[PDB]
Amino acid sequence: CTHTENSAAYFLWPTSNLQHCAAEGRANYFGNLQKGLLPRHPGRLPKGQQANSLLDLMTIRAFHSKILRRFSLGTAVGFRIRKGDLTDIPAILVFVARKVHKKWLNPAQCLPAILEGPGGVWCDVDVVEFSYQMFSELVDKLCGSDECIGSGSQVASHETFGTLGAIVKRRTGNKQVGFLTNHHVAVDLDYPNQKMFHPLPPNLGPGVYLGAVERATSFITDDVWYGIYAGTNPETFVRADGAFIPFADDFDISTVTTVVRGVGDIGDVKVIDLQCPLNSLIGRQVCKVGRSSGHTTGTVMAYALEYNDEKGICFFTDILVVGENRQTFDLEGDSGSLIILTSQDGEKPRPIGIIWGGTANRGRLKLTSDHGPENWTSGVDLGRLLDRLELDIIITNESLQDAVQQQR
Amino acid sequence: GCTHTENSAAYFLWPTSNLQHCAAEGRANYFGNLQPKGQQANSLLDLMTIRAFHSKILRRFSLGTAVGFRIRKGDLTDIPAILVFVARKVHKKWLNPAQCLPAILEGPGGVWCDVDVVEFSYQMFSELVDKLCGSDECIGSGSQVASHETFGTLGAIVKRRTGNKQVGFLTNHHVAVDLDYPNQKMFHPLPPNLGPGVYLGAVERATSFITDDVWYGIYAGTNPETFVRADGAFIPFADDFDISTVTTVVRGVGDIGDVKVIDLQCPLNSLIGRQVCKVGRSSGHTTGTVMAYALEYNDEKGICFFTDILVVGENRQTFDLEGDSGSLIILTSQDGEKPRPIGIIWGGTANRGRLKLTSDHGPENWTSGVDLGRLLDRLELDIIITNESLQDAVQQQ
Amino acid sequence: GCTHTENSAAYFLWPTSNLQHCAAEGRANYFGNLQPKGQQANSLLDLMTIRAFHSKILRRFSLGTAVGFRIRKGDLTDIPAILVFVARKVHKKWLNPAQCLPAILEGPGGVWCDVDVVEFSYQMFSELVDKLCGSDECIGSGSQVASHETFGTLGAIVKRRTGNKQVGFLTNHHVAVDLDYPNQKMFHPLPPNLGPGVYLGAVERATSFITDDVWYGIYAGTNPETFVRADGAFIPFADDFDISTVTTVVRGVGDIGDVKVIDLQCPLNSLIGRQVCKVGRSSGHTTGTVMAYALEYNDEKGICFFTDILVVGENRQTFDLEGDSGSLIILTSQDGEKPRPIGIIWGGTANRGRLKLTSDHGPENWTSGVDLGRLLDRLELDIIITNESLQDAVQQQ
Amino acid sequence: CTHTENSAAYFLWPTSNLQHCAAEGRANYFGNLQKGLLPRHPGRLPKGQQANSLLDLMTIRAFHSKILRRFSLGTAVGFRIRKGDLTDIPAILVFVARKVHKKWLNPAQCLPAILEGPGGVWCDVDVVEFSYQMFSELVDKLCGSDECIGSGSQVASHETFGTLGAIVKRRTGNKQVGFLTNHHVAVDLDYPNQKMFHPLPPNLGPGVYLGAVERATSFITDDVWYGIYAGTNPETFVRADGAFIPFADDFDISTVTTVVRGVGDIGDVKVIDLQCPLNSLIGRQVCKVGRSSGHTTGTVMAYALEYNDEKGICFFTDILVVGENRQTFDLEGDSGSLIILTSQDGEKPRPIGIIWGGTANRGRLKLTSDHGPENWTSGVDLGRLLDRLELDIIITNESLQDAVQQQR
Ligand SMILES: Nc1ncnc2c1ncn2[C@@H]1O[C@H](COP(=O)(O)OP(=O)(O)OP(=O)(O)O)[C@@H](O)[C@H]1O
Ligand SMILES: Nc1ncnc2c1ncn2[C@@H]1O[C@H](COP(=O)(O)OP(=O)(O)OP(=O)(O)O)[C@@H](O)[C@H]1O
Ligand SMILES: Nc1ncnc2c1ncn2[C@@H]1O[C@H](COP(=O)(O)OP(=O)(O)OP(=O)(O)O)[C@@H](O)[C@H]1O
Ligand SMILES: Nc1ncnc2c1ncn2[C@@H]1O[C@H](COP(=O)(O)OP(=O)(O)OP(=O)(O)O)[C@@H](O)[C@H]1O
Ligand SMILES: [Mg+2]
Ligand SMILES: [Mg+2]
Ligand SMILES: [Mg+2]
Ligand SMILES: [Mg+2]
């Protein structure tokens, strides 16, 4: 062979947040916030100090998380939901096993309507009750009837199967062309390789060998992923689930399309800037094309969903989506699907995330009294995922052909 | 220390009165002594007396019996009848004479009735259901009440007639009781391990089975071990529970009148065929029809079991779902009178019973209800039906 | 009809006394008021008082506690001690100061004791076993007694002190009770659906949990919901049962003396370390050692549970098997006196508890026993220990 | 091909006992017995009228079966067991869920000590409490290590496996040479064929194709099998389980031995004459060589075991064996093993049965107070089984070679 490739199943597990200095760095940050707080009057809050960004909301939530998570199942940041509808009121969402009348809650349990954080920036606190295939020509094509491979296509390891998310290329090294899907779909620890096939692996049925997972990430610290401390727990991780599969050397890349079937041509990834106005993400209509539920549409309901489970480990998921018109946004098997902003002004729809859709990252949510609870879906921030995997999205077939010729 | 006395032990009483020789011989003597233009049955007592006397031939090739009105082509008649439930109703051509049920039975004293054959076997969302399950500012009939593992519906606001005369509520036995626990604490709408809620109190007393002669005042059959399913539980409100948050209204129904005793000697149509309703935590407000009374057991034990009230929901819809256990069964208003409660739903629904009425539809669910007048007597409870009477009951505890 | 009155309903009482504010405040007031050459504990009361006062720090990193004598290198000492049960006993090098248990605790009044750490967790064939299981011409302590699904051992011949003063027997609660059944009939040795046997009678009354202050006469701990596992059931003999076939002897032991009350103020070695025996339907005659008293709960409820007696069988053999539930725990004769019963086996054994004593052997089974004196008081029963006293009891029913 | 073979899975099920005349024939027999009974005194029974045969005992049992089976789990005929030992006292054995003292039984339940039947013949009634691998060089050889096939060898269909019982030849038709095993081991209804292999079928491991089941019987009426009515039920059947497998046309019969390994050369089948003295069967020591437990020894404890289960169907099993010295006589997998009388006077051991060892034909029995219950085994009467299948046993290798040359 020409160059040396890694020939070992090799695993690195996080230890940085377990260094006394790394925990002290987080403790010092919140100690600083606490030392300077000087909370405002028993009273009125100025409008210019109202939170106006994801980062504004996430810092208020982190600062007040002990009281917030004492009698709740989780929190996220977004807009207050009132009578089932999104308002334009910036808010921390507090998820509860069941919303009950104030009269059945002592004052310690009853959430406040307003929280003021460090620097005087304040926001609303909203209470949301919360818990943790299709037949069409499109679904047929995604699962094997189509002459091309692309976003939405079924991708299968020996064990599980999911949805190809995007056509991508490595920024460094061999600069190989491949695809992005989620890590759980693509990986099984009982095997030394992770081969992927479309539509099925040889033990289960017909299919072409697409290539094998080269690298994948599951957990990333919040301070590395978001650039801030998103909570006070020294062990805080984002489920940054993602796997990169370089196309096999004898796989015909001319069968790959960069089009998202059912959507059309998409634009470049839209990064989530934590400092821009909330309404460029929260409340935006999204769509996804998956091998299980085909094309669906939904609403981004919240960002940076937090969950505290068995040990003193805090877990974040980036994007919370609910399907429109009381239809589920996804099903099991849609994991890896691209989460795409629908066009507002005629611009190409742009991807913002990839469906996580896994172990505990699908559940139910209650919005109205006249109808049953609704499924919610979780997504990983795509701009951040591409950064950690060091990949670029390829959005045109002309750019795909250039990228193939430029592999080394 | 404390001022008054109350339960400090989980203490169980089990029935033994019917196992006495003299008790069984009294029952055998009654029937042994007893053994067509006959002044034909006009009351529940008349039908139950005929069925008890003929229970042996009736139970031989059947799944159980009840009393009511003959059902013909799926419609209730006004013909007084013993209903005989069978696993499958088949043409008379396929039955030997011993198996084919009669059309008429004559009982002691010449009182007679008809015999009818019925084929038989043993979540909703709304603003109302949301109020019952935690969104309302009050607790009352229909509210979700929860033990650590099981959930049901509060039936009535009640007061004990004796002892500490405590105010509390009535619900069903095993919505309220978990045998892994030494106490029986109940919450609205959820226990703390599952979600938020107010601690209501704990079960103080409950009853499950009662002998037929004590419950009905008559021998309901020839089996010396005959019992009635009487699964009711009484929960006194906790010392720190604010009873000013309690309503005596039945939301979705309104103010109710006093309990309507089921008198076995009154005309059959004052109970059979009557329209009823219920407000429950799972299905909200539903409407149904009383189809039968005093249904027997078919569970192979060797022991007769009775259930008081059989209800089928109107327009082929289910009258109750699981979680409606404990809801009040209420006679709907007919001539302007306040609706009056006659029973309480016995939970069921782990293995539902269904009955076949017409050939063009599948079988329909049926609901069991416990006779409320008799249940209140056995637990020595008075129902409280106005908020002013409730304030009085609180002061008198 | 009948002449005397008896139970006609399955009726359940559940404890609520400890849920009163005044009851819990009395307990909190007692301990709040309370808060090394100290006249060091000499009785069960002394140890239980120290353990209750320090229960919070003791229960923080432990699976439960009991009182007795320190165990050192697997052998019982005569050193009065609180035993602290842990999931695994580890070297002090691996414990922070908050976790490492003390060696000495001083309680109210300066009374002190030792603190000991024990690692812990929650068929035989013979001529005797054949006699107990149906081959003997008599029924007595040790005989197999069976419900429709569960089987156990008859504990004692007893008489009710009040009401009908009926003669019957004492056994454990859930050998005797099946919650699917309205009655609780028991047979020797098998119910009719399984094999031949004589109908003994049915359960009349039973108790499972009792508050600690009512059972022990003291607060056994700081938890306002503290209960004792008191699972005993009383079965009056059936009207047609021939009590002349009943013996008061304990086969394999002999004539027993009266129940030996466990007095909390007497010296510890009159109970702790005492040799005991038991005659049970599954393991026949076994011998064991009383290792501890008043063991606490560790079951995460939020509720303290107590068990009275902890027994480990001698020579590394099990003291009981499943089916021995209900056997009498009897102090063996030491100076010629008749053996005297002190407890009754609480069944267990679905998920046995074991404790580690030495490093060269696996963990050993331990047996739970219920304090017999207190159980008899709570069910208002007198034990009958001679056949002449039994004839008297029969005549006086 | 030369001659025509059956090319269909074809099933015949008994209907004869359902004819009104066949039920009347049985009813008339017991009606005759009842009409003439004239029972003896409240008292003494003559010795010359004491039952002295299997047939004597079986007729007393049939005549009195209503009272016998009212409070019992089954009956058999044999010798009274007293304090765990066989006596020489002819008796009906009555099997009970548990033996209890008389004092716990009303007089209706308590069995009598004596029963007198038609003709004045009488017998004892005995009460018995009752309910429903190994590593050695021999077991290795039986399961595949041996160079030969013979009695005791493992024989496997695709699903189950058992023990080859005897080398046999058909009395009629093609007169093919093959082997006898039990029907349940050899047969599965989901397949059209029943191929048998030693030691394993191809889906499970290595093995040679032995041939396929040609014919098998499961249930035979008592009056056909025993030559008498063994009970009053118009639906009475013997579990006459047996399957005949002719050796495949390309199977090398020179690999077959007629020796019973661990026993030696055996004699001809010993028929069970229902009129001969009881002690030529009851109480006799037996042995069996099976693929699961190898060579074991046991005692014939009883004959014509009766069982009444769900419908009004009475079932008989011929031979009841208990292992010696509290060792189990067989295990699952020994089904089909030959049940052989050990030598008394130096004569070759002779086979009397074949282990049924199946659905409900193994259970436990209590004999002593100082020890736990013991396993019992069931066998099918071999002389009768060979008659119904029309087969002869081959007991010498010289006779085997003659039989092969004489196949047509
Ligand atoms: N810890 C809690 N658990 C459950 N319910 C709670 C809790 N704290 C508050 N609530 C309920 O949530 C209510 C506030 O809900 P929320 O903040 O969503 O109001 P809103 O957005 O103005 O209106 P809407 O309820 O229609 O969304 C309180 O009035 C109370 O009934
Ligand atoms: N033991 C039995 N098991 C099953 N079916 C029986 C049995 N005995 C009678 N039947 C059937 O039930 C019929 C009687 O039905 P039933 O008494 O309900 O009549 P109906 O009320 O006049 O009419 P409908 O069938 O419309 O209700 C018999 O004619 C026979 O076909
Ligand atoms: N919370 C705890 N969990 C587990 N092990 C503990 C804990 N606290 C103390 N220990 C261990 O138990 C030891 C004390 O044991 P213990 O009191 O039984 O001593 P001993 O009776 O003198 O000797 P022996 O170990 O022979 O019984 C400590 O030295 C420590 O190793
Ligand atoms: N229906 C029955 N169910 C259970 N046990 C019974 C029944 N009828 C009788 N017995 C018991 O069986 C006893 C008779 O047993 P059996 O006929 O085996 O006696 P045996 O052979 O002389 O002695 P051994 O009991 O030592 O075998 C009776 O005394 C009685 O205790
Ligand atoms: Mg809201
Ligand atoms: Mg009808
Ligand atoms: Mg120690
Ligand atoms: Mg015997």
Side-chain angles (χ1 to χ4, degrees), chain D residues 206-218:
Chain D
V208 65
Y209 174 55
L210 305 171
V213 177
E214 179 195 279
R215 70 210 36 263
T217 58
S218 62

Side-chain angles (χ1 to χ4, degrees), chain D residues 270 280 284-287 300 339-343 349-352:
Chain D
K270 181 72 154 50
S280 58
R284 291 292 300 276
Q285 184 187 39
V286 289
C287 61
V300 178
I339 298 163
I340 307 166
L341 295 167
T342 63
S343 184
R350 291 174 69 181
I352 59 171

Side-chain angles (χ1 to χ4, degrees), chain A residues 35-83:
Chain A
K35 186 74 184 186
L37 177 54
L38 256 69
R40 255 196 192 95
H41 324 73
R44 64 287 182 191
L45 276 299
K47 180 63 153 194
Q49 288 279 89
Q50 188 177 22
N52 183 231
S53 66
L54 287 171
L55 184 54
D56 282 350
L57 293 180
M58 288 169 68
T59 296
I60 299 169
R61 188 258 306 269
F63 182 81
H64 286 293
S65 50
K66 187 191 281 284
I67 65 153
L68 285 176
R69 74 181 188 275
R70 195 188 161 186
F71 294 115
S72 73
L73 314 174
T75 58
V77 302
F79 284 127
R80 175 187 287 287
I81 307 169
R82 187 162 273 158
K83 294 191 183 57

Side-chain angles (χ1 to χ4, degrees), chain C residues 70-74 89 115-118:
Chain C
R70 172 187 290 287
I71 299 168
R72 169 169 284 116
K73 285 159 190 90
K89 185 168 177 181
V115 177
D116 186 51
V117 181
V118 176

Side-chain angles (χ1 to χ4, degrees), chain D residues 27-341:
Chain D
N28 175 72
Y29 169 76
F30 289 103
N32 284 348
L33 295 186
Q34 182 65 29
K35 186 74 184 186
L37 177 54
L38 256 69
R40 255 196 192 95
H41 324 73
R44 64 287 182 191
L45 276 299
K47 180 63 153 194
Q49 288 279 89
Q50 188 177 22
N52 183 231
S53 66
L54 287 171
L55 184 54
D56 282 350
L57 293 180
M58 288 169 68
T59 296
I60 299 169
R61 188 258 306 269
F63 182 81
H64 286 293
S65 50
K66 187 191 281 284
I67 65 153
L68 285 176
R69 74 181 188 275
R70 195 188 161 186
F71 294 115
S72 73
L73 314 174
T75 58
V77 302
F79 284 127
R80 175 187 287 287
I81 307 169
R82 187 162 273 158
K83 294 191 183 57
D85 300 297
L86 277 186
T87 66
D88 59 359
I89 303 172
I92 295 162
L93 301 198
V94 183
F95 299 120
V96 298
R98 184 121 133 205
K99 199 154 163 185
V100 305
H101 193 288
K102 288 168 160 171
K103 210 169 264 286
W104 321 128
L105 306 167
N106 70 0
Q109 296 177 283
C110 188
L111 290 147
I114 299 282
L115 270 181
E116 166 182 5
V121 179
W122 60 272
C123 72
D124 282 287
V125 181
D126 188 55
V127 181
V128 179
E129 178 171 315
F130 173 101
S131 68
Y132 297 91
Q133 272 73 32
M134 316 300 189
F135 302 107
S136 66
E137 175 76 5
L138 173 53
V139 163
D140 270 15
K141 289 186 155 194
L142 300 178
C143 296
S145 304
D146 211 335
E147 66 185 10
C148 60
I149 297 310
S151 185
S153 288
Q154 173 169 311
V155 292
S157 64
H158 299 112
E159 298 283 39
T160 77
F161 76 128
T163 303
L164 186 157
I167 308 306
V168 301
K169 70 178 185 195
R170 198 92 210 278
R171 302 176 186 166
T172 63
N174 303 328
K175 188 162 159 177
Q176 287 203 253
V177 174
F179 63 94
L180 170 69
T181 192
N182 73 283
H183 157 67
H184 271 103
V185 157
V187 162
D188 186 351
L189 267 297
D190 295 316
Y191 298 68
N193 277 313
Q194 306 297 339
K195 302 197 263 174
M196 297 215 78
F197 302 84
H198 170 87
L200 280 178
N203 70 339
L204 290 180
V208 65
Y209 174 55
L210 305 171
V213 177
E214 179 195 279
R215 70 210 36 263
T217 58
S218 62
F219 295 109
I220 314 289
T221 66
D222 55 325
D223 55 301
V224 162
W225 182 261
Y226 295 123
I228 65 152
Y229 299 119
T232 61
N233 195 327
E235 307 182 56
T236 300
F237 298 89
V238 180
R239 308 180 171 104
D241 198 285
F244 168 58
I245 297 84
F247 283 124
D249 54 19
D250 70 336
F251 176 81
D252 182 7
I253 302 192
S254 86
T255 63
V256 168
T257 182
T258 57
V259 169
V260 177
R261 283 156 295 173
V263 173
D265 312 316
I266 65 174
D268 201 356
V269 57
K270 181 72 154 50
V271 303
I272 299 172
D273 190 317
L274 301 183
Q275 298 182 4
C276 75
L278 287 157
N279 67 349
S280 58
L281 177 70
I282 313 299
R284 291 292 300 276
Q285 184 187 39
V286 289
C287 61
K288 77 96 191 66
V289 181
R291 61 74 44 191
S292 288
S293 60
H295 171 286
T296 57
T297 68
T299 306
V300 178
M301 302 296 289
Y303 189 80
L305 164 66
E306 152 165 14
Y307 169 56
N308 291 279
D309 90 322
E310 336 220 307
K311 276 309 145 162
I313 315 278
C314 170
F315 293 102
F316 279 97
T317 303
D318 293 312
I319 301 164
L320 177 57
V321 176
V322 170
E324 287 189 302
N325 304 310
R326 303 202 36 100
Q327 311 297 337
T328 186
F329 186 65
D330 73 344
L331 295 166
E332 190 184 21
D334 289 329
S335 180
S337 298
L338 212 57
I339 298 163
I340 307 166
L341 295 167

Side-chain angles (χ1 to χ4, degrees), chain B residues 201-374:
Chain B
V203 180
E204 176 193 86
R205 61 196 57 245
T207 189
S208 50
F209 296 100
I210 297 162
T211 62
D212 59 330
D213 54 307
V214 165
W215 184 260
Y216 295 122
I218 60 161
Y219 299 125
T222 62
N223 194 323
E225 311 189 40
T226 302
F227 299 95
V228 178
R229 276 96 164 257
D231 264 319
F234 165 59
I235 298 80
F237 284 123
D239 276 354
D240 67 283
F241 180 83
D242 183 10
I243 304 192
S244 76
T245 72
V246 173
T247 181
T248 56
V249 172
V250 180
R251 283 155 296 175
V253 175
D255 303 321
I256 59 175
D258 206 6
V259 64
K260 186 72 158 48
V261 169
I262 297 175
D263 187 326
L264 299 186
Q265 302 192 14
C266 81
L268 292 159
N269 68 3
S270 73
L271 174 69
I272 304 305
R274 291 294 301 281
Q275 180 184 72
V276 290
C277 65
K278 79 93 192 61
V279 174
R281 153 265 179 267
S282 295
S283 61
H285 183 291
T286 61
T287 297
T289 301
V290 175
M291 303 294 286
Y293 189 76
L295 166 73
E296 105 175 317
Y297 74 107
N298 226 76
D299 294 283
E300 196 264 90
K301 270 69 160 178
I303 286 204
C304 207
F305 303 84
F306 280 85
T307 296
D308 292 312
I309 303 167
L310 186 151
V311 177
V312 174
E314 289 190 338
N315 296 343
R316 281 207 79 244
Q317 310 196 72
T318 188
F319 186 69
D320 66 334
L321 300 175
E322 186 168 6
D324 289 331
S325 189
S327 305
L328 267 190
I329 304 175
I330 300 168
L331 291 170
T332 61
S333 184
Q334 294 308 103
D335 293 318
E337 71 286 354
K338 287 196 188 59
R340 294 178 66 183
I342 60 163
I344 185 158
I345 295 190
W346 179 91
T349 63
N351 302 103
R352 307 213 56 154
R354 280 139 218 155
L355 52 87
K356 197 66 157 55
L357 290 175
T358 57
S359 66
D360 60 327
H361 302 93
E364 302 184 33
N365 289 340
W366 57 266
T367 298
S368 307
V370 176
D371 183 317
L372 183 58
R374 291 178 163 77

